[PDB]
Design an enzyme around this catalytic site. Sequence first.
Site, PDB file in Angstrom:
ATOM      1  N   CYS A 125       0.864  -1.191   0.000  1.00 24.28           N
ATOM      2  CA  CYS A 125       0.000   0.000   0.000  1.00 24.28           C
ATOM      3  C   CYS A 125       0.895   1.233   0.000  1.00 24.28           C
TER       4      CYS A 125
ATOM      5  N   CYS B 112      -0.765   4.211   2.033  1.00 20.31           N
ATOM      6  CA  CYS B 112      -0.966   4.138   3.505  1.00 20.31           C
ATOM      7  C   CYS B 112      -0.501   2.805   4.108  1.00 20.31           C
ATOM      8  N   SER B 113      -1.382   1.804   4.238  1.00 22.61           N
ATOM      9  CA  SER B 113      -1.030   0.539   4.944  1.00 22.61           C
ATOM     10  C   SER B 113      -1.964  -0.624   4.614  1.00 22.61           C
ATOM     11  N   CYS B 114      -2.772  -0.474   3.569  1.00 22.88           N
ATOM     12  CA  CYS B 114      -3.896  -1.340   3.303  1.00 22.88           C
ATOM     13  C   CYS B 114      -3.410  -2.772   3.129  1.00 22.88           C
TER      14      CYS B 114
HETATM   15 CO   LIG Z   1      -3.178   1.496   3.129  1.00 25.64          CO
END
Ligand SMILES: [Co+2]
Lengths: 202, 202, 225, 225
Positions: free
Chosen positions: A106, A109-111
Amino acid sequence: ENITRKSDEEIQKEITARVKALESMLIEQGILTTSMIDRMAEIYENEVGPHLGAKVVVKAWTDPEFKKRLLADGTEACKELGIGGLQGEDMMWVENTDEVHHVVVCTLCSCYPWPVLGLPPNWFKEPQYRSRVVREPRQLLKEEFGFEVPPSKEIKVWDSSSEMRFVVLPQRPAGTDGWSEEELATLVTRESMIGVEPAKAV
Amino acid sequence: ENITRKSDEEIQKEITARVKALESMLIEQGILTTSMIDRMAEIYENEVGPHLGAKVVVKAWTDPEFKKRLLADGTEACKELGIGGLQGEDMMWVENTDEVHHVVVCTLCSCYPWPVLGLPPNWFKEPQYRSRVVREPRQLLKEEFGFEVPPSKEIKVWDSSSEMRFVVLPQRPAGTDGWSEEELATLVTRESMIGVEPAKAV
Amino acid sequence: MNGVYDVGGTDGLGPINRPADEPVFRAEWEKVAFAMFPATFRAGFMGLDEFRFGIEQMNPAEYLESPYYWHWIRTYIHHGVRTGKIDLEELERRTQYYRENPDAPLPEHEQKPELIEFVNQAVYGGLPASREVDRPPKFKEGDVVRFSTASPKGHARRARYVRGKTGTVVKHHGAYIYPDTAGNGLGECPEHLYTVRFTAQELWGPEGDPNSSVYYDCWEPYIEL
Amino acid sequence: MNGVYDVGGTDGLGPINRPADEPVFRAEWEKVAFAMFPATFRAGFMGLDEFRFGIEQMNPAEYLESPYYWHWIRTYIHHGVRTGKIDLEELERRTQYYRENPDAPLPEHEQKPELIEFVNQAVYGGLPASREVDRPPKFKEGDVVRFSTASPKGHARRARYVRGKTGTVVKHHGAYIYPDTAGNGLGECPEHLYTVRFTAQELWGPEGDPNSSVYYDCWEPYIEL
Ligand SMILES: [Co+2]
Ligand SMILES: [Co+2]
């Protein structure tokens, strides 16, 4: 190194005070309780982890028709094993072969597919991996994970820019012919299903 | 705000120690002396400043043929007034009109025509101005400098990506007909020659 | 390189911090930092392009919020350590000594008349980057050109915000030191230099000012058409 | 927005920091931060897109080096203050109180069975973003499409590194919540979603891996051809 940055101790102490302050106001507004916080933590500490993803993997390894359904629709196939929900409502599983290596990121972000892997490890959410894996994937896999993907082998990088969550079905290690589902599972790692490592040898 | 950042006092104290350490080693190698440091500082504190740029401006305002030479070749024209050298070996001067407003930036670092303006002010070298002026120049000029450039007026942003240094010849304020070179100079600012302000009114 | 330092078109960096007046030098340390520009190039080992590249390699969080002249200290040390002319262990030892003894003296040293002459000459004479080359300019005023989408990992002057964008050549300036070589220690290999005009709509799409252009300097290999 | 958070293809951020093992939660504060994802959307006022946009607006130097769950605290406060549900003055007062009295109690409060039911249901039921729309997909597998060079100042999922680049549509997934509206408080306005394949040479020019592709999810308005 950053000469402008406080100590880890000073950062932790300031964050702790800011969070307890915020938590005190959210409690008074009734939108947060100690029981609600404890339940969310308990779920991702002990209920939802990569052991779930490992079951999906070993089933696909030992069940050609389940594998086809997993690759067609990851959400529907994972529901067959009672596996799904928050941050994995839409999963697309992708297959490691001799032709193709998959790795997921991601960049924004951090998905990450919580329902099969639990919460992502810190390195996954941090700028170093996120910035580099879309641009130097072979070099990153070599330098960080000791994983040499030969130049002739295509590296596919899946950037989760949407609610679609990408999950790697790693190749079945050699020398595991006729192994039980439980034996095969000992070979399936969080890393193998991000695509930063293969499944364990031997 | 950055919760991870030390106090200005702690930053200054750490930078001071690191610089004195570096300076002590460069002195021992003979590539830095107290006299060399004092001379560089004295030059850009008291010899080279925007008063030099102001002379070029008032000459172009009062001398149509000098103005044409300035716009053709800024380096050669500025040499007529004994003005040139380090970080202004290649100057292109650009003319504010009723049709066109010019503003200059170094998006990649801090590049700036030292020989006419002296060293750039800190805001010019910092990320806030550098990031925004190529993307929202009208809004930046309005919000930061109280300078309203009407929408019908084109804004040209000059990004010094090369050793070419861009310098703004601002418009001659109204009501200055027949003023002396010295009177006109009181109207020419550092800001007027970056293009973030016009020359002073009245 | 695709560094954070390349901030043109970056959103979210916040309002300009502009005090009403400021001195040229805010602290004595800033004068020492400044004096390292002419010290580094005096010794012909490294030039302006390599000096820039050292800054580009900074920790971005440090770059974004440090006093400007800290950038100059980082790049001098970066080249110092790489060339072995600065011993990092000795530097950390000295930093600690001067943390604990801030008013301890500098090392005794002879002044050098040649360093003053070199300074005065560089300042008023300049360090011109213009060069003569054997080939003529490939391009001219009015040529419509697309900026390269190449993304070198070493030094270059390819702002992300102009890559693959279309512009008009405005002026050919002659040939100059070529960053993509000079900044990577690969020498001057000078190239024709052009100013190119990009519209705000080309750079930013519909969110760009409807009546604005950006002028960006492009070395010949940066552009085609 | 053109934020620093959009780090795909950024150079110079340094080597990965990966400890050999780590707990899910490194500190009790991280559990409180985590619990604010389901607290924020429980109250239907704000969704996942707006939660992302709060993070994107962080001070970049703070974003780049802070513990991850600090990002969650920043975005909760960002929306708190904007909607007037969090009083900043009261929050700063409480921060100082808890700096000086770290083991002071939390406010007395009733537990809520409905919050446990809401949590269990969200976790195992999911919060699906797929929607039905009246128009069919504009595009299909094999379509060769160019990603928009639009540069919205509010929330979007337009990684700088894919803008104006050419790819092949790989899969149509159905219609989903559209970030460019949902994240800017302009509602779901759902759009068809596609995975698009971009080659490394398309993304990076000659410095890209000769045998690599990036798959990036594109809402319909992000692509044409
Ligand atoms: Co993310
Ligand atoms: Co500069």
